[PDB]
Symmetry: D2
Subunit: 355 residues, 4 copies
C-alpha cells in the first residue's frame, strides 16, 4: 500500500506510529475532495486542512518559520510568520485560484469564538496549480468545503494521493497530490517527532529518484499528460529562528526526489513546533506579564531534527506518488506511478530490499 510497505525504505531514520504528520501529538488533518465530471467544467480539486493543536490554534500559538526555495506560488498569512514566528490558525492547502475564498472562510470560522477579543485573523493558506485536470478558472472551492475539511480534521492515519487539495495534482508526470511521513528521534537525541505533509505537484519525469535510485530514467516510456507546498511539524521546542532553519531542510528532501530546479514550481515550505505551549494569544489592548518562559533545542541537538525533516519530506513525496491513481479529465490523462511498476524500475537500476 504505502512506500515502506513495498519494502522501500527512505533514509535511515525510524517512522512514528502512523508514519504521518499526525505522529506529532495533537496535530490533526482533514480533506475535502471534489470530483465531478462535467466536460471542460470538470472539478478535480479540494482543500486540505492541518490543525496544529488538539484544540483551537488561536488559543495555543505555535512557533513557526517559512522557507521559500522558489516563490512561483501564492500564500496567505506568511508575513507575520516571518516577522514574529507565530502560527495562530489552521493551515490549509488548495488550488491557486481558490486561496482567497479558503482564507476568508478560515477567518469566518473564528468569528463566533472571538469573544470581543481584539485581533485580526491571518490564516495560512498555500496552493499548487491543478489547471490541467481541474477547471481552475471555475473557482469551485467554497466555505462549505473548508468547513467539511475542518470537521473531518482528526489525528491518526492520513489519506494520500488524489485527495483534498491534492485531488487534481500531477507529480513527475505521474499522478500527484497529498503525501505524509514522520520520523522519531532516539531518546539519547531528545526523543522528538518530526512529521511532514506535502502537496506534490512538481517535476519532470526523467528526474524522478526513489531512495536515491534513478528510477525516472527507466520510466520515460510511460505516457505523460504533458509546485510543492510542504508543512513540517515537530514536538521539539523550537524557537521561531529554529523553525526557519527546519523549514529549509524541505529543500533537501525535495532535491533528493528530483525537484527544486523548475522556474514554474511554487516551492514554499512551512515548519511549526508544538514544544512550547502557553504562548500568549494575541488580544490587543489587553496586557499580561513582561516575559514568557520558553525552551530552546540546543544547536548540538538540532542536526538530528534537520536529518529527520529531510527524510520525512522525501518519503512524503514518494508516498504521494505511490498513492496516486489514474485520472482522465478535461481531455488530459495522467497515470498513477504504479506499485509494481515502481518496484520493477527500482530493480532495473540496481535497488534491492534489505541490502
Amino acid at each position: 500500500m504505502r512506500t515502506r510497505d513495498l519494502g522501500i525504505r527512505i533514509g535511515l531514520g525510524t517512522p512514528g506510529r502512523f508514519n504521518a504528520i499526525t505522529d506529532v501529538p495533537g496535530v490533526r488533518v482533514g480533506h475535502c475532495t471534489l470530483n465531478e465530471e462535467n466536460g471542460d467544467a470538470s472539478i478535480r480539486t479540494g482543500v486540505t486542512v492541518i490543525e496544529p493543536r488538539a484544540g483551537a490554534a488561536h488559543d495555543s500559538p505555535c512557533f513557526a518559520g517559512v522557507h521559500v526555495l522558489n516563490g512561483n506560488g501564492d500564500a496567505t498569512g506568511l508575513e507575520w510568520i516571518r516577522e514574529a514566528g507565530l502560527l495562530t490558525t489552521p493551515i490549509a492547502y488548495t488550488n491557486t485560484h481558490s486561496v482567497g475564498a479558503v482564507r476568508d472562510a478560515l477567518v469566518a470560522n473564528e468569528r463566533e469564538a472571538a469573544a470581543g477579543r481584539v485581533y485580526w485573523c491571518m490564516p495560512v493558506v498555500m496552493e499548487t496549480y491543478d489547471g490541467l485536470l481541474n477547471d481552475i478558472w471555475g473557482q469551485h472551492v467554497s466555505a462549505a468545503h473548508v468547513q467539511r475539511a475542518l470537521a473531518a480534521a482528526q489525528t491518526g492515519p492520513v489519506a494520500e494521493g488524489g485527495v483534498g487539495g491534492g485531488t487534481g495534482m500531477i507529480c513527475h508526470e505521474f499522478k500527484g497530490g497529498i503525501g505524509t511521513a514522520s520520523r522519531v528521534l532516539a531518546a539519547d537525541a531528545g526523543g522528538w517527532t518530526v512529521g511532514a505533509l506535502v502537496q506534490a505537484n512538481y517535476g519532470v519525469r526523467e528526474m524522478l529518484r526513489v531512495a536515491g535510485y534513478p528510477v525516472g530514467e527507466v520510466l520515460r516510456h510511460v505516457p505523460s499528460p504533458f509546485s510543492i507546498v510542504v508543512t513540517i511539524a515537530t514536538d521539539a521546542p523550537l524557537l521561531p529562528h529554529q523553525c526557519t532553519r527546519l523549514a529549509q531542510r524541505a529543500s533537501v528532501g525535495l532535491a533528493r526526489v528530483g525537484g527544486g530546479t523548475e522556474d514554474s514550481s511554487g516551492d514554499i515550505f512551512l515548519a511549526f513546533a508544538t514544544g512550547n505551549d502557553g504562548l500568549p494569544a494575541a488580544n490587543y489592548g489587553s496586557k499580561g506579564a513582561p516575559t514568557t518562559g520558553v525552551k530552546m533545542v540546543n544547536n548540538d541537538h538540532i542536526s538530528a531534527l534537520f536529518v529527520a525533516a529531510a527524510e520525512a519530506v522525501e518519503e512524503a513525496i514518494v508516498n504521494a506518488l505511490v498513492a496516486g491513481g489514474d485520472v482522465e479529465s478535461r481531455g488530459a490523462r495522467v497515470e498513477g506511478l504504479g506499485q509494481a511498476r515502481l518496484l520493477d524500475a527500482l530493480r532495473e537500476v540496481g535497488w534491492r530490499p534489505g541490502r
Copy 2:
C-alpha cells in the same frame, strides 16, 4: 486650501508632479469603492482601493517590482512571486484585514475572460490594514461587486484621499486616517523620472505625529481619541527587480519621519513597482520565446535621487491622508479629522512658519 501643500506646508525639498499623486506616473490609475452603512455593531465603514500599474491590462505588460517589510503584522497576497522574480502582473488592491481573500479571488475572476487559453496562474497583490474599530470587520462586507466598482472607477488625475475606498474606516495618529498620495519629479539632468506614492495609513499614537519635522503631536494630546500602513511606490524610472526592493525600503524613511515604525501591532508592508521597462514578456507556460530580453537599468549613481523622492512622497502622502480625513462616528467610537486650521495652529505653536 484643501491638501497639505495648499496650506503652505512643504514636505521635504523636492518638486511634486502635476497632481501630486501616484497617477503622475503615466498610465498608473486609481479607483475607490467606498462602503458606508449604519447598523449598530454591524455598521459598515470599509471598502476597496485598486491601483492599475498600466494604461491597459497589467497581465499584458508586467512591471518590475519589489517588496520591503518594516513590520509584518499584516496580511498580503501575491508577494512571493514579487520576491522571487520581481514581476507585478496584476492590479494592486487595498482593503480591510478580513476581506483580503474575497478581494484577491475577485481579482483572479476578473482575468478569466481575457485568459483565452493562455496557461498561467493569476496571483493578484492584495494588502490590508485593520478597520475593526469603526467597521464591522468580522462581518466581511466587501464583495466581488465592490472590487468591480473600484476597477471601473480607476482613473488618472486627482486621487480622492481620507476616508475613501480601503481607507474608509481607518484611523491614523488617533485622528481620521485612510488614503494618501503624493509625488516627486526629478530634474532632467537626474533622469526626469517621476516617483509616486499611495498609502493606506492606519498606524500611530497621537504624541508621535510629526509634520514637516515639527512635533505637532506633542501639542495635540488634548484632542479626544477613539482609543498598520500599506505603501505602494510607483516610478517610471527603469528599475530592475533588486532596485525596486531598495526603493520599497525607503518607505521606512518617509513613515519614520511622520512618527511611525515603532509599533509591534502595525502591519507596515511596502511595495514598489517600476514602469520604465515596458517590453517584459507576459507569463504563458508551455509557450517558449527568445532566450533573452534587452532591458534598461538605472545606474546606481542615479538611484539616490529616486530614494529621496520616494521618502518624501511617502511622508507627504501620510500627512495628506490626515489632512483629508474627516470626523467619523461609528460602532460606539468617535474619531476627529486632524483639521486644517488646527494643524496650522499646532504647527505655529511649535515654531513652524510659512
Copy 3:
C-alpha cells in the same frame, strides 16, 4: 564637553540612562584606539572602536543577536551566523573599510590563549565606514596592536564621542562625524529594561540634517563643506534572535529622523544584541550537553516600548556624534565641527526652543 541633552535639546520623549550611553546596558564595555597623525597625504586619521557585550568573555556567555541592513554598501564580518542562529560570541569592532580584515583576524588571535582545546571557529563581528577623504585609507595603518589597545581600554561608564576610535576620520552631513552614543530606560511597569546605541556616523548630505525634527540643515547650507553608518543597539531585555532582528531594524527609524537612509553610497548596517538571557551554551563542537535550554522571551505586547527606545537612542546618538565633532584639516581637505553655538542658532532660526 557638552552633549546634545546638555544644550537643552531633547530627542524624543524617553528618559536616558545614567551615562546616556550604550554602557548603560549593564556589563557592556567600550574602548577606543585613536590614530591621529599629520603627515601630508599619508596622514593617519583613523582607528578602532570595540564593544564588549559582556562583563567577561563574550565567548563564554553568548548573546542573542540580530541584524538589519537598510543599505548594504559596506563590509562586515561575522554576520552570517548572527542571521542563522542569532548568537553573538565575540566583541564587536568598528574601523575603516580597508582595515576590516586585519581587525577581524586580530580579534581571532585574541581568543587563542583562552581556547584551551575547545573546538570552535572564531567569527568576530567587524563593521566599517569609509574615512578615505581625511585618512590615508590605502595605507592600511590599523594593526593587531591597535585592536589590543582598544580591547584593553574597554570599560563601562562614559564613552568618548566624535573623532575618536573608528570615528576619528569620519564625516556626517558634511560636518565632522564619528562616534555617538545614547540610551533610554523603560519604566518599571514596561519591564524596566535599558536600550543603548553606539553609532559610527559617516553619512548624509548637508541640507538633509534634522535635529529633534527641526530642519537645521536647510539653514546651514552656507557653511563650507569638505566635498555609511554602522549602528549597534544593546539591551538587557531578554530578546530572542528573531526579536533582535526587529529591534535592529528600528535603527532605520532613528537614522531617518536625523536625515539619513536615502544614499546609494551609504553602508547602513545595523546590529542589535540582548543580554537578558545569560545562560546560553558556549560553542564546543564534539562536546554535547543537555537537549534544551530554558530561556526568557519578551512578550510582543511589551516589545513596542523597546522599538521606541531603540529609535530614540539611535537618533540621539547620531546628533551626539555631530555635537562632539571638531574641525579637522587633513590631506588637503577641511571639515568643520557642527558647532554647539551654531546649532543652537540654527535651531532657533527654524522655531526650536529649549
Copy 4:
C-alpha cells in the same frame, strides 16, 4: 582520474571542455598550497582565488547573488552582493581564521591600480574549517600566499582535492577539498555554460551518495578522523535577482551528495554571471549616463540553468572526494575515498557501468 573518467555519470547533462568552472570563458582559478609538518603547529591550509573576468574584476563588474543554506561560517564582501548584486573583486577561499588577512591582502592588491578613483574595496572571501589537520589558530596564511594564488590564476584544467583552500579539508569523513565541474546548454537553450567550484568540508560518512547510490552506507567500516562554500559561474546574462535564484540551486546539488543537514556546516553559496559586461565601475563623485542597457535571461529559459547548476555542484563535490588522498597531521589521520574503493561500493549498492 576524475569521477566521469571512472565511468560514473552525475546527472543528465553535458560537461564543457575542462569540466570545470573555467569553462565559463575568461574565468580563472589559482591555488596556493601550504603543506608543512611541525607537530601541533603543522600547516595544512592555503588559499584559492577565482578571477571572474579575463582582466581586473573592478573594471568589469559581474552581476551576482548569494544564498545561505546554513550560515555557520564567515565571509567578507557579501552585503553589497545582497544589496546591489555586483561582484567587483576576485573571490577567495581559505580557512576560517585567515579570512581577514586574505581579504585585506586583496584590498592591498588593488591599490596601485586605484589611481585616484574613489571607492572602497570590498573583496569576497569565504571559508571552511580545517582545525583538525591544520594549525588553524596559528594563522599561517599571509598576503604573500594570496599573491602566489593570484599569479597562478589561469584558465583551463583546475587542480582538485587537497590543494589551495582545500588543502586540509575533510568531506564525509574522507579527504575533502577543492572540486569543480561544468555543464553546457544546447543551442536550443541559449548555449550557455554553467560552472561550479566548491571547497567541500562537510558531511557524515553514512550519508555519502554518488550518482544517487548510497555508497556511504556500505563504507562505515573505513577508519575516520572523527562546511561547504560554492561558487557558481555562468556566461548567461543573469540579473542580480536571477543570480540569487541560481545560487540557491547549490542546495539541490549538495543535498544529492548527502549534505545540508548539519548545524555545524557553513553552507554558503555565491553565483555570478558574465553575460552582461560594460557594467559601470564604482567611482563615487564621477557620474555617467542615467541608465545602462543590459540583458536578462527570460524565465522560460532559466530552468535549464537551474538544472545545470545543481548537476555541476553535485559532480564538483564528488570530484573533490575522488581527488582526495590520505593525510596524517597533528594527531589525526584521514583516508582518501579511493577510486577503486568507490567503484566497489557502487557495485555493492547496485550501480553498474555503461548506464
